[PDB]
Amino acid sequence: AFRVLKPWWDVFTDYLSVAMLMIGVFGCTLQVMQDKIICLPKRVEMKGLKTDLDLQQYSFINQMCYERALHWYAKYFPYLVLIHTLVFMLCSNFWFKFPGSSSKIEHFISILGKCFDSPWTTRALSEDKKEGEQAKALFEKVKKFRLHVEEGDILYAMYVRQTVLKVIKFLIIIAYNSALVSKVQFTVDCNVDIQDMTGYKNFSCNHTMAHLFSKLSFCYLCFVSIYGLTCLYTLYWLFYRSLREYSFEYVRQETGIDDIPDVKNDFAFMLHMIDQYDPLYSKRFAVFLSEVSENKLKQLNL
Amino acid sequence: AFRVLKPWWDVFTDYLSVAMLMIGVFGCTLQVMQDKIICLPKRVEMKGLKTDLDLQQYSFINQMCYERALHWYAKYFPYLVLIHTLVFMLCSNFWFKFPGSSSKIEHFISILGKCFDSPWTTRALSDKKEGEQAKALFEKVKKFRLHVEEGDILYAMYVRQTVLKVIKFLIIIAYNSALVSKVQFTVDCNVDIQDMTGYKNFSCNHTMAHLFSKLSFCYLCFVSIYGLTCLYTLYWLFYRSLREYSFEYVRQETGIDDIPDVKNDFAFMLHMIDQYDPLYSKRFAVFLSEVSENKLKQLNL
Amino acid sequence: PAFRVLKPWWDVFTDYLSVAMLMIGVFGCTLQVMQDKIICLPKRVEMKGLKTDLDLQQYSFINQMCYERALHWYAKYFPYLVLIHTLVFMLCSNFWFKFPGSSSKIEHFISILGKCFDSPWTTRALSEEGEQAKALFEKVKKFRLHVEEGDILYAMYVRQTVLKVIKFLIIIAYNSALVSKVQFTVDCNVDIQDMTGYKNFSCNHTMAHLFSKLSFCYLCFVSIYGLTCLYTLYWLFYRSLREYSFEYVRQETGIDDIPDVKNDFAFMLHMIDQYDPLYSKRFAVFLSEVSENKLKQLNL
Amino acid sequence: AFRVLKPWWDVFTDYLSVAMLMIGVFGCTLQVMQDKIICLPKRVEMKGLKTDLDLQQYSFINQMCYERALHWYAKYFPYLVLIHTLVFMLCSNFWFKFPGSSSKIEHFISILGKCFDSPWTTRALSDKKEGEQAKALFEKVKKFRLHVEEGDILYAMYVRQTVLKVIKFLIIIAYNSALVSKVQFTVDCNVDIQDMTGYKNFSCNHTMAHLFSKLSFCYLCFVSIYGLTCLYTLYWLFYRSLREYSFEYVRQETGIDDIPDVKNDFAFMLHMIDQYDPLYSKRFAVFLSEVSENKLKQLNL
Amino acid sequence: AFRVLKPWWDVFTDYLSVAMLMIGVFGCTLQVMQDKIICLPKRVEMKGLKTDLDLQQYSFINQMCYERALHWYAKYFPYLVLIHTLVFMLCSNFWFKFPGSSSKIEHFISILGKCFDSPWTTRALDKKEGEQAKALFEKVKKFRLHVEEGDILYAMYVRQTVLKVIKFLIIIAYNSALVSKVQFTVDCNVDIQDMTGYKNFSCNHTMAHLFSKLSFCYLCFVSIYGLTCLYTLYWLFYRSLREYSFEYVRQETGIDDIPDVKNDFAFMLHMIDQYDPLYSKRFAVFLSEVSENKLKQLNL
Amino acid sequence: AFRVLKPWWDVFTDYLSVAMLMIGVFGCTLQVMQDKIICLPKRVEMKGLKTDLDLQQYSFINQMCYERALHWYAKYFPYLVLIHTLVFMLCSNFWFKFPGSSSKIEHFISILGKCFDSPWTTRALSEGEQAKALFEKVKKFRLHVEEGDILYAMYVRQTVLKVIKFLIIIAYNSALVSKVQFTVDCNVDIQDMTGYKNFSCNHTMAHLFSKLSFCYLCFVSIYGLTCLYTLYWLFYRSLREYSFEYVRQETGIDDIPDVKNDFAFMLHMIDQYDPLYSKRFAVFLSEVSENKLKQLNL
């Protein structure tokens, strides 16, 4: 699968998002099962007060003040969480499933798998007709892959745009979610004009799930902040190391085959992406990139 | 399997349809557990007001004003969404199963898959079993090129389905935008029940009126994106005569300057595949020249 | 299962329609007994309310007395009728698999075609083993004496579609006739005064504006169903299903002596070539004395 | 595969029984969900009557009049439906699963199945292993004829079973038709609870009275059809000698003119097997002539 | 393959046991669903009586008179029927899983299954088949030596049947004794005067007319079960099952050197011959020394 | 699951545990379905008595007296039943899944299953490579087990824990069975907020819990009796030393040695299921049989 093409920052978030999502789901459930606002008329030994209100006047007051007193944030806290998590997940898996930049990844993975474990690699890095035929076919495949992928830049622009979009969505969320968080309170006042229906004008209301939504909001800000720090680090990683230019220096130094060229653009990007998992697949691919090795295979074929 | 024949617009529209179904199901789920209407009579220190009504008269009033005061759009918003999503699903994946129509596509897919990995293409672009495989490839290519060139059964149907989807777009957006303002919270109910209840005018509240409005806005936006994608698909479909294909670049980049020009359904399929990866075309075009057949026969000896 | 190739497109279409009809019927029945089925109030023929002075059980007495005295019989038993009609359709669609007289012949035919479809001699004849081919030929010979003796496997297939068409016509008739009798507000005039004190009541049927909509849907479905059946009723009449003629195979193979079969074998070939038009081609070679002449020559 | 020995009636009655069972189960299911009875006292502008009764005295009245005024049929109809259906199913099944009467059936089925695929059967109608298998099957059939052609234990039980089922039909139809008129909607209840409630006469409504009646009618219909088929069986076992079979058609057609006429259990079972496909009879008949055995012996020597 | 060692009576008994179980679960479920007792105070135009009792004093009275007036049989009838059914089931199967009486059964059944597919039996009534027959003969001798002195596979059968019969007698006894105490309306005289104000109440038990019918049905079913078990108990004792004579097989096969088995093996043969009286002949063929001498002669 | 390595003791105790769990679940289900307390005030022609209490003062009274008047046994009986049956099951099952005492069990079962059907047993009591392999695996397993302990002490240690737990359960169930009453009195000091100080309460599941407690006591008693008999059976001879004596006279072989420790322990256990596996194993325990097999192989 696409496990080799995923640094830590691209799997770490792959869990954070999930966590975020479940919070949202929990909220939604608890917003439906649990009760809601409860409102009582205000009058601005001990004996109780008689309001002389029915069982439907109370429901009318409750469901009028629910939407005439509560701030829009308190009413819909978790739906925004679900929307944001869904958009984040859509961002994380954009260039994997987009045609025009998906076949290249599949071909690269297939060729890397083929060349990772080859007898010719063992023979070449140490210092039959079938093996020689397979080796020659794989060299031709590598050459055609190089000429077919070493011209475009689609697998880098998409990734840059993706990270930029995730970072900006971070900034917006931490902006507004932090702005509107003191408006989730417990006891509110409701001043609606229902005087000819119930006989009372001012009410005091208690929102049930206020404290819990406040706690969940703080947890969500924390998780988002971690997400944003990870994304910022990735964005720094992209824009510092000149990711569109590879350099086979260490392979040349500790291999002895001093003719490996420096590939650029998309292939260099993919090499930089695959050496963050296990820095040896670059060696195996570099084996199949020297005219010297091709000449030695031709000579041994005879 | 079939992912190769599904361009980006198709998957984009499928995701939009999935989201549409999700919001429809969300609305349907909420309507059962929360939605209701509460109606009170109108009479046009602080003390309460006595109406002197039972628990049966209140239910009478509620369920009468529900169906005599609410606009039909507010009552059944999400069922329309579900029906439209169902129609959109039916329109998609419809040009696969109207006739059998599976042999014509699976045969082409298998042909292309076996042609892509044929070493003969690589050798031209640079044992007995290889010769037998090449002979079978040529024979089945000939059979399929003879079968396909019969008419238009997998091209016009695509046009019909896209046109139907666009028409459904226009209608849905039109009447969802027209009536989106009939979802209100507080309404006035004027029913003539005075000889059994005593009150004539009532004021009612619909529980879910600030949420159906937002779900409607989200649904309308998703609809608009869907329609824009469909319009682009139609523009691309009708801008280029996809029933005729020319191997202009293949002959120049390969040197075999005798490859013919195929048309109708086969050309349509070739253009369909050209979007995913413009490499299968050359691999198939390798097995389309009689000179290649002559070379294969000569080398098999 | 095994009896899958013996289903033209309209058969699976009608199966899907029938299952959808059953879903609608069960949905309606479930929604029926899920809520309060009626709300009835007495009638008395600044603003202040009216005190009926009725207990909590007198209201239930009134509700369920007027429910079965003011509602039209259609508004109550709609889902039950939907279920009954769907079950009848499903039973009718399969009254040619379970009858032993037709089941035996169908199993024999399917076994013969299964044996013939994977016989190398068919490929040999079409391109232009041994004892098994001869034995299969005698099996085919016996087969086209066992079945070709009358009209049993075909008479019931044309007898059932007529019944289905009649049922669809009757359903349309009495379901469009009585769709406007499902009202929302009704008047109930029962004589319960020594128990309650009120004689005239006004009632609301809660799910009256729902059964209406479902009804429409139901009609539409049967309408489509009807059309399909009509096509099949037309498909069995323009061409004589009891006469078959091997013509294209003769020209595409050259074995120009295959005869024209009649009766149930002809009908079965007609009904099975619409699934995959090659079973007739594969079977055709097992019908000519030339094929057996070549078999005997090859054996010697 | 105990389906070859099942004429059309023995498979029609099974579906009838399933339908009867589902009707009974549906009725028994709604027997509990819906509230049973509603009783109010009788006093033998417009204002209501103040009964001045609690919610406990109402329950007392309802649950006393329920069992002091309703007829036993109106209360126990579904249970009787289920009991009768279970008895019918048990009677239909008391033919395969009785020791001393099940081994013969399986032996016959296995022998007939093996004989249906012997190539000597088709050979006689125009290899060492095949020859010895044919000889062994000849001996097995000869032994079997000496096994189940002495006692009619497998034929008397079928007649007993069908007679009992007909009797049950008669009883069920009789009493259901007699009592179906006692399921009423509105009833009167005259119980002596005056020192506890203050009222002596009550009027009650039985909610599930217009429904059971309908189901009851349906039940009869199904049962009626059931009985008819059983009656047909008690004309098919008695219009000829069911214990004397005649292999006349096989001799007059195939040519083998020495096949014997079996009798008793074997004749009855052949008459039954000849109600599915008249080809098993001749496949078994061909393995009953000494001429065929002599021909096989000559071919073996 | 235990069905062969399962006479007809031990199928009918299993069916009766499952019927008893379904009746019991039926009763328990409908006991859960209902509302149980309803109690009202007694005062030992028409106007209703005001008892001036709260909504919790009714619950107090109802549940006090429940376990102060109802008989112990009317409350725990379903539990008793379930317990009896479980004991019956665990009693009928206590000779398959008890160690020391299970290995013998599996050995015997496996051997009898092996000694059915043998052409030597057909010959009575080639090197590999001869060796297989000799091995089977050696096995016959060895286990016939094995299960010949430990005669515990038939005492357990008699003991379980006796236990079942005794349990039948007890159940019938106290079910007939206490079936007239399931009454509908009862009088409850509890001393609660300073908490409710009333001293005497009259109560109705909801499930007083369904339990009577279920009790009668249970009595009928258990009576049939007991009659079957009584017949089986008579069967085991009118003749010694510990001795078997192979008279008919000897007279029919002319191998008249067959000895008479005894004790446990005689019991197993007596049990098996009542399913299909043919395995005895196969074992008779495969237990004689004449047959093995003939086999040895043929082998050479 | 190792049926042969289970005697009547194990099967009977497993069935008893199943029944125990059944009644425990039944009681817990009824408690969670229909079980509560109903309390009324006390005043220490017939007419009704007015308490003048709301619909929430009753809830308050019921909740307060459900915690100050009901004994902790009356409320938590099914939970204790479930916990104790669970621990019994775990203790009885904690003998095969120990990391280090499992392979010796299934390997022994496989060896004996192979030895049961070996033709050499038939030949002796009346394929050479297979017989040699079986002899080899047998002798290596003997060497491995004769020095490997922690397969006999664990059995005793688990069957002693069951006995002690039985004793404790009897102890605290017999004493607190008379505290499950139906009618109880509740004297809580809530007068300024309810108006009454003394209440009489009914617990709705007193009699049923009494019956279930009696059934539980009987079932434990039987379980403990069986466990005591098992302990007696283990502790009256050297279960770790088996004597191959009758084999010599009833087989003819005179060179059958007596195995030591855990292997003798399993031999003693498996002898009761069927006293014939010892025969098949003793056939292969002779050092002359291997010599005869080697001679016959040539």
Swiss-Prot record, chain A:
Record's subcellular location: Cell membrane; Endoplasmic reticulum membrane
Tissues expressing this chain: Expressed at highest levels in skeletal muscle, and at moderate levels in heart, lung and peripheral blood leukocytes.
Topological domains annotated Extracellular: 182-211
Superkingdom of origin organism: Eukaryota
Effect of residue 29 to C: Alters channel anion selectivity
Cysteine-cysteine disulfides: 39-205, 65-190
Similarity remark: Belongs to the LRRC8 family.
Free-text comment on this protein's domains from its UniProt entry: The volume-regulated anion channel (VRAC) channel forms a trimer of dimers, with symmetry mismatch between the pore-forming domain and the cytosolic LRR repeats, a topology similar to gap junction proteins. The cytoplasmic N-terminus preceding the first transmembrane (residues 1-22) regulates volume-regulated anion channel (VRAC) conductance, ion permeability and inactivation gating.
Disease annotated for this entry: Telangiectasia, impaired intellectual development, microcephaly, metaphyseal dysplasia, eye abnormalities, and short stature: An autosomal dominant, pleiotropic disorder characterized by variable features that include telangiectasia, gastrointestinal vascular dysplasia, intellectual disability, skeletal dysplasia with fragile bones, short stature, and eye abnormalities. Patients exhibit striking cutis marmorata in infancy.
Cited function: Non-essential component of the volume-regulated anion channel (VRAC, also named VSOAC channel), an anion channel required to maintain a constant cell volume in response to extracellular or intracellular osmotic changes. The VRAC channel conducts iodide better than chloride and can also conduct organic osmolytes like taurine. Plays a redundant role in the efflux of amino acids, such as aspartate and glutamate, in response to osmotic stress.
Protein name (database record): Volume-regulated anion channel subunit LRRC8C
Organism: Homo sapiens
Residue range from the parent sequence: 16 to 405 of 803
Curated annotation (Swiss-Prot), chain E:
Part of the whole protein covered: 16 to 405 of 803
Domain commentary: The volume-regulated anion channel (VRAC) channel forms a trimer of dimers, with symmetry mismatch between the pore-forming domain and the cytosolic LRR repeats, a topology similar to gap junction proteins.
Top-rank taxon, per record: Eukaryota
UniProt tissue specificity: Expressed at highest levels in skeletal muscle, and at moderate levels in heart, lung and peripheral blood leukocytes.
Name recorded for this polypeptide: Volume-regulated anion channel subunit LRRC8C
Entry's localization field: Cell membrane; Endoplasmic reticulum membrane
Span of the signal peptide: none
Record gene name: LRRC8C
Effect recorded for residue 29 to C: Alters channel anion selectivity
Connected disease: Telangiectasia, impaired intellectual development, microcephaly, metaphyseal dysplasia, eye abnormalities, and short stature: An autosomal dominant, pleiotropic disorder characterized by variable features that include telangiectasia, gastrointestinal vascular dysplasia, intellectual disability, skeletal dysplasia with fragile bones, short stature, and eye abnormalities. Patients exhibit striking cutis marmorata in infancy.
The protein's role, per its UniProt record: Non-essential component of the volume-regulated anion channel (VRAC, also named VSOAC channel), an anion channel required to maintain a constant cell volume in response to extracellular or intracellular osmotic changes. The VRAC channel conducts iodide better than chloride and can also conduct organic osmolytes like taurine. Plays a redundant role in the efflux of amino acids, such as aspartate and glutamate, in response to osmotic stress.
Disulphide bond pairs: 39-203, 65-188
Annotated organism of origin: Homo sapiens (Human)
Transmembrane segments: 8-32, 75-94, 158-179, 210-234
The family this protein is said to belong to: Belongs to the LRRC8 family.
Topological domain spans for side Extracellular: 180-209
Coiled-coil annotated spans: none
Oligomer status and interactors: Heterohexamer; oligomerizes with other LRRC8 proteins (LRRC8A, LRRC8B, LRRC8D and/or LRRC8E) to form a heterohexamer. Homoheptamer; inactive, likely because it is not targeted to the plasma membrane in the absence of LRRC8A. In vivo, the subunit composition may depend primarily on expression levels, and heterooligomeric channels containing various proportions of the different LRRC8 proteins may coexist.
